[PDB]
Amino acid sequence: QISVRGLAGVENVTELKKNFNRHLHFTLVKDRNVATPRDYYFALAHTVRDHLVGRWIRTQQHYYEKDPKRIYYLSLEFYMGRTLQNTMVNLALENACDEATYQLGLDMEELEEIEEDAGLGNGGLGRLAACFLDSMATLGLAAYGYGIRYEFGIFNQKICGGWQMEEADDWLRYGNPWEKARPEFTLPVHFYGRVEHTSQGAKWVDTQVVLAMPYDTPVPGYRNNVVNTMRLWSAKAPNDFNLGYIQAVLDRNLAENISRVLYPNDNFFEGKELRLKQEYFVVAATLQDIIRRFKSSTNFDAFPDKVAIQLNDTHPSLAIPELMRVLVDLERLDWDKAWEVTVKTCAYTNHTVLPEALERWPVHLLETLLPRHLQIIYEINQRFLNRVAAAFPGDVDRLRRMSLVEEGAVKRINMAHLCIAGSHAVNGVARIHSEILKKTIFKDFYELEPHKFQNKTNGITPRRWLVLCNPGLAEIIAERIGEEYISDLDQLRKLLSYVDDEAFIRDVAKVKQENKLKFAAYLEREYKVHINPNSLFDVQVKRIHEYKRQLLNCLHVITLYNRIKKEPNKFVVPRTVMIGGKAAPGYHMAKMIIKLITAIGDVVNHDPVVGDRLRVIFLENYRVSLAEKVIPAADLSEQISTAGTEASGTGNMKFMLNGALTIGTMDGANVEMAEEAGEENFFIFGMRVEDVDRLDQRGYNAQEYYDRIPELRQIIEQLSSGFFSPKQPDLFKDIVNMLMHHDRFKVFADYEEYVKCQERVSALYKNPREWTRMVIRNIATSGKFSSDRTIAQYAREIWGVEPSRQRLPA
Amino acid sequence: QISVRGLAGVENVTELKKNFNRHLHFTLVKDRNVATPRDYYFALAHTVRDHLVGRWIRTQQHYYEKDPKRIYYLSLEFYMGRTLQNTMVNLALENACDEATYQLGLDMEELEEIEEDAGLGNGGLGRLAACFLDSMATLGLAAYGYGIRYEFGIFNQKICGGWQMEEADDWLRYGNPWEKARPEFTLPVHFYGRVEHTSQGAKWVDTQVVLAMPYDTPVPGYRNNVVNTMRLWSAKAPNDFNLGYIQAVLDRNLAENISRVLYPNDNFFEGKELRLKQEYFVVAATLQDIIRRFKSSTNFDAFPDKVAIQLNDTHPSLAIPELMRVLVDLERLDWDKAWEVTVKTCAYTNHTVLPEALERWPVHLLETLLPRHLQIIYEINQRFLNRVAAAFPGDVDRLRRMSLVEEGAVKRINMAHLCIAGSHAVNGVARIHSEILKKTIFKDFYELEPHKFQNKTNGITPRRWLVLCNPGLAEIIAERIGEEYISDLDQLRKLLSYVDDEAFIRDVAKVKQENKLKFAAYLEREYKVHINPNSLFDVQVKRIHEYKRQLLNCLHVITLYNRIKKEPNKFVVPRTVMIGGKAAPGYHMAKMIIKLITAIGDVVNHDPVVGDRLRVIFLENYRVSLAEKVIPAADLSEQISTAGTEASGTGNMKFMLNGALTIGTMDGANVEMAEEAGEENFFIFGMRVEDVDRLDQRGYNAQEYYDRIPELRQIIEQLSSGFFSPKQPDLFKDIVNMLMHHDRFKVFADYEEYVKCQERVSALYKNPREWTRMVIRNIATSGKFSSDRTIAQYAREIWGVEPSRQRLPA
Numbered sequence A, B: 001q002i003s004v005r006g007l008a009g010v011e012n013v014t015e016l017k018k019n020f021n022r023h024l025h026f027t028l029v030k031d032r033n034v035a036t037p038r039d040y041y042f043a044l045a046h047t048v049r050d051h052l053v054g055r056w057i058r059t060q061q062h063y064y065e066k067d068p069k070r071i072y073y074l075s076l077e078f079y080m081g082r083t084l085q086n087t088m089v090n091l092a093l094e095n096a097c098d099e100a101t102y103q104l105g106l107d108m109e110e111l112e113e114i115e116e117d118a119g120l121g122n123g124g125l126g127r128l129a130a131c132f133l134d135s136m137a138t139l140g141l142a143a144y145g146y147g148i149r150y151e152f153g154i155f156n157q158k159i160c161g162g163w164q165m166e167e168a169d170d171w172l173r174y175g176n177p178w179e180k181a182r183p184e185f186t187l188p189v190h191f192y193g194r195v196e197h198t199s200q201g202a203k204w205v206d207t208q209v210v211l212a213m214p215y216d217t218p219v220p221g222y223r224n225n226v227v228n229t230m231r232l233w234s235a236k237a238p239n240d241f242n243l244g245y246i247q248a249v250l251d252r253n254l255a256e257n258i259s260r261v262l263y264p265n266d267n268f269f270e271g272k273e274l275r276l277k278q279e280y281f282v283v284a285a286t287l288q289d290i291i292r293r294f295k296s297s298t299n300f301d302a303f304p305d306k307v308a309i310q311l312n313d314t315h316p317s318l319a320i321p322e323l324m325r326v327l328v329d330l331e332r333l334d335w336d337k338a339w340e341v342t343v344k345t346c347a348y349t350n351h352t353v354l355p356e357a358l359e360r361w362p363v364h365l366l367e368t369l370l371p372r373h374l375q376i377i378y379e380i381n382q383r384f385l386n387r388v389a390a391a392f393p394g395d396v397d398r399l400r401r402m403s404l405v406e407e408g409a410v411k412r413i414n415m416a417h418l419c420i421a422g423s424h425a426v427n428g429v430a431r432i433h434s435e436i437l438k439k440t441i442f443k444d445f446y447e448l449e450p451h452k453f454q455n456k457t458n459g460i461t462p463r464r465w466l467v468l469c470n471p472g473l474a475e476i477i478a479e480r481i482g483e484e485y486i487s488d489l490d491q492l493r494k495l496l497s498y499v500d501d502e503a504f505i506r507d508v509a510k511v512k513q514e515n516k517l518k519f520a521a522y523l524e525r526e527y528k529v530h531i532n533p534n535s536l537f538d539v540q541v542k543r544i545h546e547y548k549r550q551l552l553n554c555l556h557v558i559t560l561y562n563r564i565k566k567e568p569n570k571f572v573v574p575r576t577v578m579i580g581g582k583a584a585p586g587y588h589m590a591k592m593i594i595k596l597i598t599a600i601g602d603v604v605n606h607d608p609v610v611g612d613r614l615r616v617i618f619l620e621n622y623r624v625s626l627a628e629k630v631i632p633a634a635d636l637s638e639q640i641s642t643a644g645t646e647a648s649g650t651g652n653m654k655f656m657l658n659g660a661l662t663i664g665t666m667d668g669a670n671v672e673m674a675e676e677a678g679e680e681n682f683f684i685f686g687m688r689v690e691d692v693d694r695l696d697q698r699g700y701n702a703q704e705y706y707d708r709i710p711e712l713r714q715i716i717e718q719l720s721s722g723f724f725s726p727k728q729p730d731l732f733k734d735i736v737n738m739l740m741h742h743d744r745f746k747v748f749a750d751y752e753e754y755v756k757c758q759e760r761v762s763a764l765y766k767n768p769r770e771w772t773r774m775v776i777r778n779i780a781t782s783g784k785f786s787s788d789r790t791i792a793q794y795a796r797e798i799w800g801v802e803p804s805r806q807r808l809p810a
């Protein structure tokens, strides 16, 4: 039907149809009489996956013959979403499969909805890993993603009585057609035990063993015939485990619990032993696999020439002492040589500045679980601190600030300090974030080793985040500038010469309207909720966090409601305000915020005076597949974190690429987005980082704002008095108290500017032509935010490898 | 190569080769450079399984269109062994696959060794279920096997220092190519809760729910294109289960533990809650599936015309009150009608008379776990006992003897009594066993309802137990009488006219010698143990039980050793004595017996004076795949249970079919085997049932035997003094004490006759011609012991269905 979806050739369509029937029969053991919709999905998945196989074998074979430097991306999170459409897109099979299924009497889009998200991540960090894998394959890098195959991913969110309920994400229940178990590479991982010092070095003995079994998932590049591997480890008990009899067999569950569930606590570091076990498990299995592949090329001098390990935050930081352990204890390298190898191999990416999220493991935990690693960390620390002492003689406070070991009630290891010490490169994920790292939280480290600190501004893949989710937009763009932009997103700049083109303006606006109608219909069908598709779609989707300031959004919503109620017969630009995102299960304030949003909806949506001029909807179970639907439909992207708190954001880039305008603070990548598009084409408001700093020095007094802004006072009074919870008048007392007395994120301080800026948004929307021209100016300058650009920068400036857009033979 | 293995046509071989390569590539994601032996096995399994698919779909479709009466065989055990060769045999694909793999440079027999046994049973009862499934498919019956998909089957047995060690049988670790998950038939099973009595009947409420997910395995008939289903249930937690967060997800293991492991305690009934849960789980899921299929044909009068449920022992006895529960509580049938339906639907097969194996569930367990079922059982009991009281007025002791409820310390439900009450047919498994049921343990029930009691003598499938495991024997038989005997085993009688045929005598003896050489080589290669292949292979393989009297065998072995040591330069017929079998992990005496056997081996095998004249080997990890190897190799089958204790035995029939002579007591099916072959062609010794009864009346005094048999005294003295355990002189004091003071199985009482009978065995073996002629007389009369005969009897006399040897279209 549409051009960017590929050719639907006669031969290909015929072959797809016959392979679909073959799989239905031989693979699913069904005929058309008894086949369920799920059977049809699986038949299609197997049909498509067959096309990856040759490319996958020949890609890995090529890496064996050419022996390039290998990139190992270590993450505890890979937020992949669905795989079927992505695979079809990257293989140019979409139209052919659509035609083939149509002729078989099936709707392919309906089949696509059957696939579970691989929800193996929490939010931005997990999704970044996934975009990165796609870009590495598209850029022809010999790259592997390594993580954990969680049996249960991020919980499914249900809203019951306005409250978040969690249910287990049993995503493997029907089987996963995109994975291949690799039992021949099953590896032992060691825990507990004790250290013995012999004549010939230390030995880690009396350990408990858990097996690590790998599962490989393909990562296809965009039409280049490259298929890379994501290898995820699953925990398996050894067969003699605990081996009264019945109990011993049942107790195998204990060992296998390691890979059972993704930790969803993205707000607050919890020193939980099971989490520590997960972190070591992925690291130990991965490093043995890396070393095996390196040997199948004695001389570890060449190790950093053939291996790069990227640590996605500090979660896999144990790679540093584990690499030392293998090199010193097993390979018998001297300490200094081993250390040089380690440093040159490892690089570390930081994803946050919030102190409560920093991993600081109690020493007593590491002592019991990983006694040899603790010893190694102590030795790393002593040698590192000796370097600090030599560089800054007499600066004793610097020594305690930089120590990997934190003294206090419980001694802790600061994993970020370990990562900086043991890496040749440290990067933040947006220019302002990387600057904050050099100036504030890692200032001491920057002063010691300034060459280590880099920036790598985040990006998103334009395959999933434009071609897949918004084919209508991709197509009208391709009609004018061709298809090359899909793997060279900077080419979108050519769209600037179309900002005055009446045909293009009409098409951009039409695609948005179509996306909005489609989403308005998705809401009615799957959720029985009714929305006005001519309203401005005002969207804030992201995990619920105080720093992300969904509360500020709530305050605006109530302001709009109160203004309408005050002057009911005055015209206002109709809005559909959509907020969605999951709260970490133990984060009380975040759960209260969700309840607030639904409570506002309950009042606003049923007020007859309001009509269809304002609607507040909580988007349930926000996840990658829902993002693919809502983002193309959005007019306004809410990116309103307190300046200095959102390291980068990536949702912001998704909205920019898909034709929404952004209202945002100068925080994270918003700064660079505004810089690319021009500040005139962005709705910027609020404190800058410097203003926040000024406010902290003075002391933040929320009362001052309450006293001087009558509209804000009214909202707080409504919240306190039970206007939004008639039967539980004090329901929101925690929220009011926090806002009034302990708001780390200065919600009131940005309120006035936010509301005024929102008025300017409404003003522009009244003029559809000018709204759309500004939209074109955003899309046209979104090129920098391709993860292809990000990955090319990692490759050249950190990994020491050249990307390549050249095809492998088909 | 050999005729009974089918045609290796050019077209078929070419197609097998190409489908093998297709699976290696597309299914296993490998090419020949990196493929492991296990990959080759899987490629072959997938190639063969493709051939089942059309037949499987068309068989089930046929049952839907013709709507025959369906047979549901309920068992907690299905001891299937390996599936690959069996599938090839039943599809006539063996030679073609052998040729195809040969041309690809692979040894098919080597590939076959890679397959794990499906070890979903303990011994005879589990293996009987498997033979029965094969026969039901071969006889064209619309039959389903229903059980549990245990994650862990019978433990793998390791021998360490002469002691049994158990390890988990992780048989699904690499995936099972013979199963298809059927998620659309996932069903809820209820536990705990409480009963409410409303205006309109009882209601079972506040239950905990565990999901039952079915997995289908094909059961191919012998060359008739019939493929029946074995459906095994797996336990799955519902998604809102226990839904702090992390723990709730980890706790899902609790629910799923139901299908985790097979109970291996075949010696002693343990009232363990988890076992009770397994029993209800299989019953509840199966009955819903049965009823669903029955409705997809309101009127339950026709239920017994369309449904037969066979209960394999009392393990699925809860089917009776569960059927009542569904009929009364859910369908609202009156009690008496529901009961009539239930009785006409259910039949019960008893497999033992040993009191300690009888299931007697504590009332307090059923009260908590299954409160409604207990109420139903109480009501069944009252109505049943009212019938007893009317039939035998004033016989108050009969009332307490026949009650389903046993009074005592803890009240218990006698599940065997429940099964008799609620079934239209009760059968034993060999003529003498069924007689014992009528005369002793169920005498009261027989007197009340004599029409209910039947015999169905056990059988084995001649597909697995001749064609598959002994193709050489199958072939020399087919050369003379054709191939029809394979599904009509009575035709083996035609071999009687060959007992004087010199060519046939030579061939029978040659096949045995070849089997023995092959097994002698298997022992050296996989276990590094050295045996003389010209010795008599004296084999006792079966689970270790006091009643099976492996100890009696041990006493003979020691007798032979002592006689050799006494007269070293006298000629004796060389023997290789092989004993194998697993002991239930909590059965101390059985574990002591294994240690005794190995301890005897340790002395006997290293005595220079003995030479290669006597060797004692413990066959480690006896299981179906090992039985397939050792049984064809055996000369002498040890079937030496105390008369009245082995209900049937089936190992006995396997040896008879494969050319071993039998030394045995007149117990179980041995009686009928001797009757078929003629007593002159069997080595019968020892007490008959009547002699055992006489001895019990008098009182069994082991001392008397010890005092009057000098050779027996010597052995006991050697055992006591530490001759067989020099470093732990008292190791075997438990064994001696048991033999001397509390031997329920009268080992000493059969000793003299056993030893004398064994002398007659040695005498015959000295004359190979006469040995072989007697062997021919055994094989030729083994026809009655085909499970095809057994199943045809069940079909006609219990299920009310006619078997059919007619082909379905290919």
Ligand SMILES: OC[C@H]1O[C@@H](NC(=S)N/N=C/c2ccc(Br)cc2)[C@H](O)[C@@H](O)[C@@H]1O
Binding pocket: A049, A050, A052, A053, A174, A175, A176, A177, A178, A179, A180, A181, A215, A218, B026, B027, B028, B029, B175
């Ligand atoms: O879903 C059923 C099972 O499938 C198995 N896959 C097998 S046998 N072949 N896959 C081949 C394959 C071919 C191409 C791609 Br692109 C990916 C996999 C997986 O190993 C199991 O984990 C899984 O549960």
Ligand SMILES: OC[C@H]1O[C@@H](NC(=S)N/N=C/c2ccc(Br)cc2)[C@H](O)[C@@H](O)[C@@H]1O
Binding pocket: A122, A123, A124, A125, A126, A128, A263, A264, A265, A266, A267, A351, A352, A357, A429, A458, A646, A647, A648, A649, A650, A668
């Ligand atoms: O760079 C990608 C994105 O990274 C995000 N960091 C995230 S999701 N950390 N999660 C941390 C975490 C900690 C413990 C657990 Br258990 C789970 C998650 C930043 O907040 C975004 O600004 C940035 O765009």
Ligand SMILES: OC[C@H]1O[C@@H](NC(=S)N/N=C/c2ccc(Br)cc2)[C@H](O)[C@@H](O)[C@@H]1O
Binding pocket: A026, A027, A028, A029, A175, B049, B050, B052, B053, B174, B175, B176, B177, B178, B179, B180, B181, B215, B218
């Ligand atoms: O082993 C990998 C997985 O395979 C799956 N089988 C699938 S997808 N098709 N089978 C088709 C089939 C075709 C013919 C026969 Br005869 C039996 C099964 C099973 O459902 C899983 O339980 C198993 O783990």
Ligand SMILES: OC[C@H]1O[C@@H](NC(=S)N/N=C/c2ccc(Br)cc2)[C@H](O)[C@@H](O)[C@@H]1O
Binding pocket: B122, B123, B124, B125, B126, B128, B263, B264, B265, B266, B267, B351, B352, B357, B429, B458, B646, B647, B648, B649, B650, B668
């Ligand atoms: O009819 C087939 C065979 O049945 C056998 N019974 C067996 S294996 N019962 N297992 C009972 C059992 C009880 C509890 C558990 Br937990 C496990 C097994 C008889 O002993 C044989 O004589 C007979 O030939």
